[PDB]
Each structure stands twice: as C-alpha cells, then as structure tokens.
Ligand binder design. Sequence first.
Ligand SMILES: *[C@@H]1O[C@H](CO)[C@@H](O[C@@H]2O[C@H](CO)[C@@H](O[C@@H]3O[C@H](CO[C@H]4O[C@H](CO)[C@@H](O)[C@H](O[C@H]5O[C@H](CO)[C@@H](O)[C@H](O)[C@@H]5O[C@H]5O[C@H](CO)[C@@H](O)[C@H](O)[C@@H]5O)[C@@H]4O)[C@@H](O)[C@H](O[C@H]4O[C@H](CO)[C@@H](O)[C@H](O)[C@@H]4O[C@H]4O[C@H](CO)[C@@H](O)[C@H](O)[C@@H]4O)[C@@H]3O)[C@H](O)[C@H]2NC(C)=O)[C@H](O)[C@H]1NC(C)=O
Ligand code: Y1B
Ligand code: CA
Ligand code: CA
Ligand code: NA
Ligand code: NA
Ligand code: ZN
Length: 805
Amino acid sequence: WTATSGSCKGRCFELQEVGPPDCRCDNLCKSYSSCCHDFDELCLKTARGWECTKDRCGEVRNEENACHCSEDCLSRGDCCTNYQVVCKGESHWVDDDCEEIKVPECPAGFVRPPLIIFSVDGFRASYMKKGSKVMPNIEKLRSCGTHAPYMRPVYPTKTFPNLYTLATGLYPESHGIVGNSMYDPVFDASFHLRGREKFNHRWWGGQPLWITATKQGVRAGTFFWSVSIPHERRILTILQWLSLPDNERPSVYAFYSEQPDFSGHKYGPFGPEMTNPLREIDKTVGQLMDGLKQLRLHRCVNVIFVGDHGMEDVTCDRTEFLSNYLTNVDDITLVPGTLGRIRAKSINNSKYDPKTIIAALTCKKPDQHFKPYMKQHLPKRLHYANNRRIEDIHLLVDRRWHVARKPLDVYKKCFFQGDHGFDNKVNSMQTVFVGYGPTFKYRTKVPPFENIELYNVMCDLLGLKPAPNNGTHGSLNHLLRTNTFRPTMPDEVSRPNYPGIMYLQSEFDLGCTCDDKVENKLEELNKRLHTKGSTKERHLLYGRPAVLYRTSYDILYHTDFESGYSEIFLMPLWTSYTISKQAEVSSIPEHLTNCVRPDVRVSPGFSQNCLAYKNDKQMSYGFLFPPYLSSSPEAKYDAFLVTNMVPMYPAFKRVWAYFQRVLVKKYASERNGVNVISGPIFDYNYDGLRDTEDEIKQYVEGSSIPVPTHYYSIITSCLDFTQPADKCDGPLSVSSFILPHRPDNDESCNSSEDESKWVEELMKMHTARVRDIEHLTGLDFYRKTSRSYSEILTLKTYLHTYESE
Ligand SMILES: *[C@@H]1O[C@H](CO)[C@@H](O[C@@H]2O[C@H](CO)[C@@H](O[C@@H]3O[C@H](CO[C@H]4O[C@H](CO)[C@@H](O)[C@H](O[C@H]5O[C@H](CO)[C@@H](O)[C@H](O)[C@@H]5O[C@H]5O[C@H](CO)[C@@H](O)[C@H](O)[C@@H]5O)[C@@H]4O)[C@@H](O)[C@H](O[C@H]4O[C@H](CO)[C@@H](O)[C@H](O)[C@@H]4O[C@H]4O[C@H](CO)[C@@H](O)[C@H](O)[C@@H]4O)[C@@H]3O)[C@H](O)[C@H]2NC(C)=O)[C@H](O)[C@H]1NC(C)=O
Ligand SMILES: Cc1nnn(Cc2cc(C(F)(F)F)ccc2CCC(=O)N2CCC(Sc3ccc(C(=O)O)cc3F)CC2)n1
Ligand SMILES: [Ca+2]
Ligand SMILES: [Ca+2]
Ligand code: NA
Ligand code: NA
Ligand SMILES: [Zn+2]
C-alpha cells in the first residue's frame, strides 16, 4: 500500500526518505511507485526547458519554469546553469584557462570541499582519445586534473557489480552483487535488472560510501536516480542541494548517466551513432561546471568522472550454444551472455554431475569461443568464487562473443551490436578515471589502477575512516595533493629461527638417495660463509618478507638462494633468488636425476620424505629454486635439499619445469636480471586468503605433507632496464603469477604440444598482483627498499595484463 494523497509541496528531492504508507518525494520515489500525487507537477517541472535566453534575463519569477533567469535566482539556488553566461556576460567554465587550484576556494560556512562523483555507464577508456573532439568539458577536466589512461573494472564487467564495487571498495564476491542477474539458493530467490527483488537490502553487503559518510556525520546526497528523471534535473537538484544551509547541505553527491552504454549496446562502441551520446554527456558536465562556477564552487568541489566498464563489439551471430555440446541441455540453467554460469535446473536431482558437464564443454571444438572452469580454478586475479551466488560452473567467454543455452533463447527473447561483461583485463572493457579539484593534483597523469582502490580515496577526500575493504590504502596517495592517509608497514608477527648444523645424516630415515659422496680449506671456509648468508644481499634484494601470522619457520641460506622454511607446512613459505642477465642454464646431471638430500639444519621430524612420494601414485615433486640455474656444479647440490622440495602433480611439473628451465632465463635476458620469489599457496576454501593448517583438504599420501592449491612467483627487476636487477637505484618493475596446481592440463587445449606452444599463455592468464599473493600467503614483501612506502604499495597493486596498447 501507499497513501499517495499526501503532497510534495516544499519537499522536492528530499534527502531523508519517509516510510510507507506516507508518500515520497525523493529521487527514488518513481522506482517504488510511491511518489505523492503532485510529484511530477511540483518536482519535475520542464517549462521553457533548461537554458536562459536573452529575452528571459531579468524576468519576473515564474515558479512554473524548470529553471530561472530572474534576478533572485542565484540566492534561491535555482538558476539555469547558463544564467550567468547569457544574462551577466560570464564565460562558460570550459572556455576559461585552467589555473591550478592550490587551496580550496570555498564560500563561508563550507566545512570541507564537497565531493561530486559523475558516473557514466559504458564509458570505454579509449573514448577519451577517440571522442576528444566532441567532449571539450571532459577533456578540460582530464588535462587540468589528475587522470589515468584507464581504470580497471572488476569482473564481471557489468553495471551493478562495478557500481557497487565503486561504492564499497569490495570485490563482488564480498559485497554480494556478483552479476546483473543472480540466483541465491539460501534465500531461494532471483535478482534481476527488472523487478522489485533488487530493492531488498539483503542482496547488498559491505558498507557503501553514503553509509560510511552518514555514520561518521558527513551528510550525503541520495546517489541513485530513477530512470525517468532527466539529466538536466539531476544536475539542477545537485546544485540546489549545494545551496542548502550549512547544517542541511550534503558533502557528497553522485550523478549517474545511463549513456553511453545504452547506445553502445545498440550501435557498438564506435558506431557512428555514438558521437551524439558523447556530445550529450559532455554538455551535462558543462552544465555542472557552469552551475558550480555560478555558485562560486568550481575551485572548491572535488569532481570525479568515472566509468563502470567499457563496451565491445558483440552481435547475435557470434554466439556459442551449449546445445551443440551437451546431451542433457534441459537439466541445466544458464546465466547467459558475455559470461556463463551453469547450475542444475533442480536440487531434487541426485543424478546431477558437474564433472560430466565440464568434460563435455572442454576443448570440444577447435575454435571454441569459451572455456569452462570450476569457479575455484578461475584465475585468482578475478577474485570470483567466494559467494554462494556464484555457480560452481563458470564459462569465461572470449571477447566479442556470447554464450547461450539453445538457439531459441536468442530469437525468442539481431537486436544488438555491443556488449560487455568479459574478463576485466580485456582492453575493450577498461573504463575511465579523472579527478579534478583542490585535493587532486594539477595536470598529472597517474598509472592505470583498479576501481576497488577508489573507495579509500573517496573516504580520504571526505575525512572519513573507510570501512574494511579490498583496496590497499595508500596505493593511490599519488593521486592527491594533500589529505594523504599515511600508511605503514604491518608488523612482523613471527620472527624466524636461523638454524645451524644440528643433525647427523644417519638421524634421517626419509627414504631419499643422492649420488653425492664426492670430496679443500680454500673452498671450505667459503661454503660455510654461504650457509651463514654471505650471498644474501644478492638473492634477497628487498629484505626478507615478513610473516604476518603466528607460526614456526627457519631462514635457510645457500649460495644461490635463500628460503623461509615452515616447520608446520614442511616446505618453504618463500624462496628468493636472483638471476643476472649473464647467468647460464645447465642440465640436471644424469647421476643426480632422483637426488634428494636431507638438510642437516632441519630435524627429521620437520622434513618431508621421499617414501611418501614413492607411495603416492598421483603426486610427484619439484623444487622451488631451480637446479637448472645453479651457479656452479657444487652449488647445484643445494638445490636437491629436502627443504627445497614441494609436491607437484606430473601434469603441473611440465608447466613448472618450462618456467624454471626456459622462462626465468628469458626474463633475465629481457629485463637485465630478475629476482624471483616463489612459493606455495593453500586456498582450499577459495576465499583468496591463506588457509590455516586445519583447512587443508589434501596431503601427500600417508604423510603430513600438505598439497598446495597454487604456486606463485614474483619477478622483480629495475624499471630502468639499463641497470641490472641487483644494482637498481630507482623504481622497480614487477610481474607475478599464481598458477593453479592442477593434476591435468585440461585448461590448456594445446597441451599435447611442446611447452613452448602453451605454457606461457597459461601463465599470462594467471597473472597476479603482489597484493593477491600477500593475501594468499600472509607474507609482506618489499620490506627493505630505497623507495617510499606509497610507491611500494602502488607496485604491489600493479597487474601485468599482457594486452596490446
Ligand atoms: C576483501 O575485503 C573484505 C572486507 O574486509 C574481506 O571480507 C571479510 O573477511 C573476513 C574473514 O573471511 C570476514 O570475517 C568474518 O566475519 C563474520 C561476521 O560477518 C558479518 O559481519 C560483518 C561486519 O559488519 C559483515 O561485513 C559480514 O558481511 C558478509 O555476510 C553478509 C551475509 O551475512 C553478506 O551480505 C555480505 O555480502 C558479506 O558476505 C561475504 O562474507 C561472508 C563471510 O563474512 C561470506 O560467507 C560471503 O560469501 C561473502 O563473501 C557479516 O554480516 C564472523 O562471524 C567470522 O568469525 C569466525 O572466524 C573467526 C576467525 O578468527 C573465529 O574467531 C570465530 O570462531 C568465528 O567462527 C565461528 O563462526 C564460524 C562460521 O559460522 C564457525 O565455523 C565457527 O565454528 C564459529 O562458530 C569472521 O570474522 C568479514 O566478515 C568479511 N567481510 C566482508 C564484507 O566480506 C575479504 O576477505 C577481502 N578479500 C580479500 C581477497 O582480501
Ligand atoms: C548498482 C549500484 N550500486 N551502487 N549504486 C549507486 C551509485 C554508485 C555510484 C558510485 F559512486 F559508487 F560510483 C555512482 C552512482 C550510483 C547511482 C547509480 C544509479 O543511479 N542507478 C540508477 C538506478 C539503478 S536501479 C536501483 C534502484 C534502487 C536500488 C536500491 O536502493 O537498492 C538499487 C538499484 F539497483 C541502479 C543504477 N548503483
Ligand atoms: Ca554499466
Ligand atoms: Ca583460504
Ligand atoms: Na609419486
Ligand atoms: Na589440455
Ligand atoms: Zn551495458
């Protein structure tokens, strides 16, 4: 029910939403069918349009008009945005030269610079270059403000997940808006772009910026806008709220445009029809900036121009149909389109088998334009698993394609030429960021960054303490002139032990063998020194990583590598080594093929054993420091220590061996040395966070040796590649990966070929940020460098994407 016979007289666009059955006058009343009878008449005036003309200047106030050109309009806060231009000889904001805003220049009574978020739907990153001739206001904001060449959205690259990520700083898996369409099974219920289910608060987790603001006594504009409210009226509403008395005026506001997405879907991203929607958005920006300048707020407000995602060319004819792969196509439900999510059609079906569905979708057609995944096997960089609303089965769809269940779904639903939702590293999905105002920097380009980082920055902009989120606070401090948060390194929780030689060979019964009985004072002191850490400055270039949880571990030094060896997990948490440009690759000699050697620094009781590997018919082993990159035949014996061994499926060993034998050396050649930190990851509950011991679901048969879910490496060099990795005076360059530790290579359809035709492609897919690895390991890297901590935080969020320009 609604008693819609109350009135909006004096309540147009009211900020506190009033409860049923009392009728509403706020910017969402239309979307609830709850607006008072007179809302349109009073609050949605349109008479005489949106611009002052010469003839209207000085006019007698007529309250019927949509906006005013009368002499009392500035004081009333309701002039047309162009009033001062037409009626007082002023210039449009866009026509003014840009002048640095060194301090906020605000009217009396302003406690802080307001923040206005100008959000645009489907605003692809390259529009900034390609549409620049038709977007003069946007292009001024961009060149005079702070801007990134692009901003990375979250996956899926859809509207609802990305807007709510912008608002909360959280991955969709955490905030719960995991798609524009979703089914939740604990509610039992379905969320869609249509209908009322999307209004229940129970879908929406986390704490969005407007709630953060309100909880800490910073008043917020209502961010959402009903679709029928035109853009000119949204802008005039924001400008009116900005004229409220000090005690009633919000400090944070949002505008939202449905364009250019709406047109992009119809015409493709660069369709000739796209020029006008870009013109119109720029005009609206101009309205806002002119309106701010009238209110003397244009050198006071911080403005963010931000997109949710980009837009790709997609047409009906590029659709893959599941009914071409499965027999049982009516036993499933598919969430279709630029991603696929599959679940059973019924939970009273015991005859449902995810394994058979995956196998039927795997490498079945030679050009196949999607790949299936169990959600826990998706690239960890997507962070797209830890929610009951994300189906176990996922299809990652090739850019430019769709997936559907049956042909009937595509003709009983060609309409469209653009779409989005693909992998968030795809160039066409990238979107935009510009920050302009006193708190942002002046004429400053910043590197591309992820949208999950902006919540922290918006909180900094408003003097708010951010709710717990997935940004790395400090990583975007380089966007800001002032208001920077001062981050600090997390304290180390566990200090390492530094064991010496404590055990005789015969104390071990590990079932291991090595042909190493081969016998000098010169070289005897020297190797003692290597075991005590004399080469450590070379192999540990950025300090040892800090362990941020309570555990028992040892530092082990060697000629060619250093490691942090966990007595709980029976393997290194990390292994660090430097490979110069000049370093040589060698083979594992024949006599040392199955060599594994007890480590006399580490008790038999805290060691792995070879017998378990022998008995485990599925599980083999590999090494963290590669025997192939030993500095000398003598140092090579160190690589076969039981403390350098890790469990590896034979299928995975093909990937690992190629990485260690070929790719490390290539990277060292190309980057003028690299430092590598490699290690295991355990994420059996796929929450993106380090597992505790008691969460491990798989051990090497008959042992306490836990099986990693993944293996990482972080590969660091000098950004200035004329300087070698081990003598770099300036900023660093990093690429990292998190490889799934899988007993098959079904993910790689070309895996029957030589590793040179597929391994590197796989690794690229599983590119990661350092920060991802930190969450997964409880380690903190880059503790000892010459660089500022904010710069290091930026480095740790970097993702190497492998896309062209
Ligand atoms: C990205 O950033 C986010 C935010 O920082 C990180 O997510 C956090 O991770 C924490 C650890 O996983 C997690 O902490 C747990 O919180 C439990 C209480 O949570 C409620 O309250 C908070 C605060 O207001 C709220 O945010 C939560 O919101 C979630 O759940 C609602 C629905 O209830 C959703 O609407 C919402 O979207 C959100 O869902 C997401 O998180 C939940 C889990 O919280 C997932 O299941 C969802 O899939 C979804 O992703 C909650 O409303 C608290 O009970 C936990 O405490 C247990 O563990 C501790 C460990 O020390 C132990 O002391 C206790 O024994 C306790 O265990 C007891 O309960 C167990 C479970 O029933 C039981 O097994 C035991 O036997 C015991 O009885 C824990 O502290 C935190 O809530 C989330 N926050 C969010 C917002 O997601 C995320 O990790 C970051 N990601 C990366 C990759 O870094
Ligand atoms: C989605 C989403 N998540 N967060 N936002 C707000 C947002 C955040 C940001 C920022 F700063 F973060 F970048 C910028 C702009 C907005 C407004 C989005 C908007 O006016 N829109 C038009 C209505 C549609 S439909 C709809 C209506 C009501 C509700 C509700 O109250 O539950 C939910 C709904 F999905 C939604 C989009 N939108
Ligand atoms: Ca969108
Ligand atoms: Ca985990
Ligand atoms: Na084995
Ligand atoms: Na394969
Ligand atoms: Zn769209």
